[PDB]
Amino acid sequence: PKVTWRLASSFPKSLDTIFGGAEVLSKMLSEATDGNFQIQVFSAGELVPGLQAADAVTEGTVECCHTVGYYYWGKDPTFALAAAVPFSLSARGINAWHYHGGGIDLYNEFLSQHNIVAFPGGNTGVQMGGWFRREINTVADMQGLKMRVGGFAGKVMERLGVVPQQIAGGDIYPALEKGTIDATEWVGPYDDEKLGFFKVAPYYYYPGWWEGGPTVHFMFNKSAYEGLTPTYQSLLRTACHAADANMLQLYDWKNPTAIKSLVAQGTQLRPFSPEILQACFEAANEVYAEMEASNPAFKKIWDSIKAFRSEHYTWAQIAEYNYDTFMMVQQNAGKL
Amino acid sequence: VTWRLASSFPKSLDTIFGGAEVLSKMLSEATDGNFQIQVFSAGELVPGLQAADAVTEGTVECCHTVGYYYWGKDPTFALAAAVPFSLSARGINAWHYHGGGIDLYNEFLSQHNIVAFPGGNTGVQMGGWFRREINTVADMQGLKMRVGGFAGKVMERLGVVPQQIAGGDIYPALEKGTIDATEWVGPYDDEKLGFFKVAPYYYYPGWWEGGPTVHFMFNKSAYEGLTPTYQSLLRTACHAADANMLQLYDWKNPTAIKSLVAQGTQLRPFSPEILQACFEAANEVYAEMEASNPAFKKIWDSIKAFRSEHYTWAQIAEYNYDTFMMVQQNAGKL
């Protein structure tokens, strides 16, 4: 049957892989229905501002959006849990929980009151730790750090004396160039290379512990979703599931070429030290303790994630870790 | 559209066999029953190991199988499924969907009347169940192991003597001491066989299968006779089902390994010496195949081109993040 919807993306077209997930979903649905199930994609600001995409869905302004749940953490930190919070699961672990651990239903139980039904719509994999003008090696090096970063990541780092900066995307490069900020988040090698941060902030840190496996949800107006035939509800879920895998796979394909290119252009890769990672982890757990004690919805979902998190990281160190470690050791020896 | 799908798998291998049921449900629901793929377990339509042969010959429209089952016909069949020391699941999927891998494999399969798309991944498989521990290459000399395919060919060069044993006859063989070890799959499936009762040393990793994909293979004429609409729907649903199986294993395996250890299973890593020896032996086998088989060389070279890039990048953000979480788990901090 003919369905004609609008999708408001939180993302600009220049974030091609993330924005592209909505295009992929739209194409999947159109093609599978000989053009009948139409979702017209719009990029950030075209219909509504990117950070208000979910609000538009709730209000019935548009039928759906493609967004990251953590954009709405200010309304309720529970929005962040199924997207990404610091020191959560990486992509395969979160996906196991989403699809087979009851995570999609748990998140939808929370979202019902907000007039939304959501399904995973991509994963970026572990993000990078950002672009730095000067090295940081110790916790003390973080004192008074001016970093363009926000949300959860920012809340955690504030416990360690960093002050998050609010700066428009296009204003970051000149701020780094002038020395007005010390560091910036962005995404990962494929997206970051285009911004040329390496020219003015050469140290590229990792891992972005605030986003170990962030899911980019498709969120649907609850009335609109419920009005679909069972056939289209099923197709929609199938297509979201495929699109979700597709984005991760695209990043997994593109990122290796991009990191090589960045290093070839003089980028200085640097791990966050064990001391820094341990401090950030401790700070994050302090924040979660407060939230769990004050917010029952948050506690329910986070306890569910944590239950699987310990099991996942027990198993992952057996076959997966040992296989991959062996391959990496071969690679470092020039043997691949 | 009413099609029959011959599975290579028995229903008791529920998560692998189940992939076909998942695809069938996705297609039926999305079309209100108009695109019906009827799923048959191993031996119901044709013998399980002849599933792709039946597709090639057009006796059935499609199958759900593992490419390396047909490595006897041409070792190229195995490459997009799993060969030793290839990519793990995210790496191979990157190559499949965005590295031209699906197209490269289909270019090979065209002569065999098949169009194939990934239909699941199991993630890294285990190294098998052993009556006695092994630590060195010397320890492998004369080892009677139930294993075949590439893995058997490689280990044979190191002195193991591969055994050809039906799934159902493995437990009794271990019980009676007629064999020393067996491979099977991983914790979820392996637990159901109760190998910990007779051969409790559970080795890892199964380096022969880092990220095995289980393909749907469709008769090319059958596929080309679908409307472009159903062709596209079929690709979308395969892509979803492929993710679904990996996600099921990633969910189930943590529970199974805990249960196995609780019941006395002794986890043991293959030593650096053993792994390196297997890696060198595998490269020797590849060098032989590449020199004699242009089709094999073309696809393997493509996988290897990405393999080195992948293992450069994966060791940065992904490995550092995950290893930090593992350390925290081990410290009781999660």
Swiss-Prot record, chain B:
Gene3D superfamilies cross-referenced by the UniProt entry: Bacterial extracellular solute-binding protein, family 7 (3.40.190.170), Periplasmic binding protein-like II (3.40.190.10)
Gene assigned in the entry: takP
GO molecular function: metal ion binding; organic acid binding; protein homodimerization activity
Provenance organism: Cereibacter sphaeroides (strain ATCC 17023 / DSM 158 / JCM 6121 / CCUG 31486 / LMG 2827 / NBRC 12203 / NCIMB 8253 / ATH 2.4.1.) (Rhodobacter sphaeroides)
Similarity comment text for this entry: Belongs to the bacterial solute-binding protein 7 family.
Origin superkingdom: Bacteria
GO biological process, one term: transmembrane transport
Keywords: Metal-binding, Periplasm, Pyruvate, Signal, Sodium, Transport
Binding-site list for Na(+): Q125, E183, W184, E209
Protein name in UniProt: Alpha-keto acid-binding periplasmic protein TakP
